[PDB]
Amino acid sequence: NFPQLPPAPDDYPTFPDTSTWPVVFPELPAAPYGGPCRPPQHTSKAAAPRIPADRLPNHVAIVMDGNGRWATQRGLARTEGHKMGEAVVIDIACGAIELGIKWLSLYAFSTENWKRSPEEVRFLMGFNRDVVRRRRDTLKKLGVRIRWVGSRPRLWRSVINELAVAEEMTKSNDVITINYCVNYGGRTEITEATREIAREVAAGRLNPERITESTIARHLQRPDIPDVDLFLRTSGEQRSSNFMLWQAAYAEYIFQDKLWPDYDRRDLWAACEEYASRTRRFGSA
Amino acid sequence: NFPQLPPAPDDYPTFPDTSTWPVVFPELPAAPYGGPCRPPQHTSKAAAPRIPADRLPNHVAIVMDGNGRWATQRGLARTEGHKMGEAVVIDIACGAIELGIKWLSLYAFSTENWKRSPEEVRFLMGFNRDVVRRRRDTLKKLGVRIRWVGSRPRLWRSVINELAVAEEMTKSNDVITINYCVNYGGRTEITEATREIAREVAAGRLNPERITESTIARHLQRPDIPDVDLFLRTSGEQRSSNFMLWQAAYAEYIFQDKLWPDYDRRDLWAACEEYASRTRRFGSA
Ligand SMILES: CC(C)=CCC/C(C)=C/CSP(=O)(O)OP(=O)(O)O
Ligand SMILES: CC(C)=CCC/C(C)=C/CSP(=O)(O)OP(=O)(O)O
Ligand SMILES: C=C(C)CCSP(=O)(O)OP(=O)(O)O
Ligand SMILES: [Cl-]
Ligand SMILES: [Mg+2]
Ligand SMILES: [Mg+2]
């Protein structure tokens, strides 16, 4: 089975049109049955590679790295790189749908980022709020289920609430799930699962001796997230930087040199073709 | 400073001579103070690169992968490759001392390797027992502090016992610490810390709302293990396979294509040179 969408007609809408910022997402033909719309094709009009379902990653995690560097190299303010990265998120979501990926986790704001200047942090909080607000209806139309993954302390209420609205609006979608990870840290996530387990123990609802690896997994914030199959990071940095820490224990790493504002869905597809050539054993044989 | 040992005299003993098995570890001249002996130099007589201490990794973790394929490519039984890996362990210990590395974690058997055949599991358990018995006096003489890291259920008692003797005999050594990781799994290690935390809660000695990331770290099996700075894996596989999961959250990954039985201390040094040259990102420790 090859779960790629059939190639788009030559005149099907494309994405992204970078002649404006924010980028205007194209109107799409209404879906016949009334379900999700077919995503716009890339402006190159490349088509997704034919990868069989048993060699496709179910869950791709991406550390979207290189935005500030991209801007500084051009003599632009670092925030201009983040701005350009918004369209890349949407392009990669479209390409993931075209390829057949069912889960996509995006590292939008790390807990490490509180070390940045408070001005850049304020920009990044407001920008993530704005991206979700600006793109939630497009994501809904594409069949995306999106929700927040992350930690509460210090995170703006407006960001949590904007994502909660998007989650409620897309809860029944099932083309692809996006974990939009904001104020996320893998050790912190595990710690919060351990706290919840501890609360249940204190209340007499859980015997400590019954705790297993599955107990931890069931007490993570979003226990429906599957293991990460393919872990991507741009800009040449070869670190997972605490992203999807529990979930990516057996992930394949494919570290790519392009900066995130230069990335497009063809780069995602190339990493997925490389993944498909690999053999995963999970400690067996 | 530059904490490397200087090049050895031309006639200083070398290691390893893989023309016999078990490999012979050479007699070494007594150390002046009566302390640890200078390790034998590599057969090639290469000397460790001059890397300043602030640029060296404090803690290197190594997944010792590719032993079985090394043997199968030669028409040998898989476990002949593991036998060749023993000399490589000791060569890498010697090279880590020459370079100035203070912490080395070695992945010798995972919690997932029980999925292998009973024949191969029996071999690997007995082999790890035998490696520790054969080499702990040598490691002691070099100033290595070695001890077991891993999970107790299923692990053979003979392995735990040999490592317990090695731990007691080297507990005062301080040239380098080797975490010898057998029946190790990062998710399981975290689970066991969470269990201990839960026992403290049930006993009224720990409040859930006082649990922090440091609480988890303090309840890992070996809480003195520092973060992994540099994570290496041989054989061309680009995955961490649940090794040092909490500790390597922020590590740099270097994937080396050589199979473990072909590896030597110069390959460890090459990876450390790459690590030392990498530009360190904003906010990193
Ligand atoms: C582009 C979007 C929507 C989110 C990613 C923003 C973000 C906080 C990335 C973290 S790494 P970055 O700021 O990009 O790193 P540098 O090249 O500036 O060193
Ligand atoms: C060298 C020593 C002391 C222990 C070897 C530890 C060990 C089982 C490493 C994995 S190599 P393995 O996965 O068995 O070999 P491949 O199938 O991946 O070629
Ligand atoms: C080195 C070890 C003792 C275990 C990790 S290497 P292993 O071959 O188990 O890892 P996978 O390729 O994921 O199966
Ligand atoms: Cl630097
Ligand atoms: Mg394994
Ligand atoms: Mg292997």
Author numbering:
A (entry chain A), B (entry chain B): 12 to 296
Sentences from the paper on this structure:
Here, we report a complex structure at 1.55 Å resolution with both the S1 and S2 sites occupied by the respective allylic and homoallylic substrate analogues. One active site contained GSPP, ISPP and Mg2+, while the other only contained GSPP. Probably owing to the presence of bound substrate analogues, a previously disordered C-terminal segment became visible. The nucleophilic C4 atom of ISPP is almost collinear with the C1—S bond of GSPP, at a distance of 3.5 Å. With the cis-like positioning of the C1 and C4 atoms, the homoallylic substrate is ready to attack the allylic substrate and form a new double bond in this configuration. The Mg2+ ion forms an octahedral coordination with both phosphate groups of GSPP, the α-phosphate of ISPP, the side chain of Asp76 and two water molecules. The other has the entire molecule moved outwards, with its β-phosphate facing the solvent, its α-phosphate in the position of the β-phosphate of the first conformer and its prenyl group halfway into the tunnel. This active site contains neither an S2 ligand nor an Mg2+ ion, but the negatively charged side chain of Asp76 forms two direct hydrogen bonds to the positively charged Arg292*, which also binds to the β-phosphate in the second conformer of GSPP. Interestingly, the thiodiphosphate group of this conformer correlates well with the head group of the bisphosphonate inhibitor BPH-640, suggesting that the S1 site contains a third subsite for phosphate and may be capable of triphos­phate binding. The alternative binding modes of GSPP in the magnesium-free subunit of MtDPPS, which are suggestive of a third phosphate subsite, may represent the transition state of such a translocation.
In the development of new therapeutics, targeting the structurally similar enzymes Rv1086, Rv2361c and Rv3378c that are involved in cell-wall biosynthesis and virulence-factor production may be a possible approach. All three proteins belong to the cis-type prenyltransferase (cis-PT) family, which adopt the ζ-fold. Rv1086 produces ω,E,Z-farnesyl diphosphate (EZ-FPP; C15) from geranyl diphosphate (GPP; C10) and isopentenyl diphosphate (IPP; C5), which is used by Rv2361c for further elongation to form decaprenyl diphos­phate. The reaction catalyzed by Rv2361c (or M. tuberculosis DPP synthase, MtDPPS) is very similar to that of undecaprenyl diphosphate synthase, except for the chain length of the final product (C50 versus C55) and the starting allylic substrate (EZ-FPP versus EE-FPP). In fact, most cis-PTs share a common dimeric architecture, and the conserved S1 and S2 sites for substrate binding are located near the subunit interface.
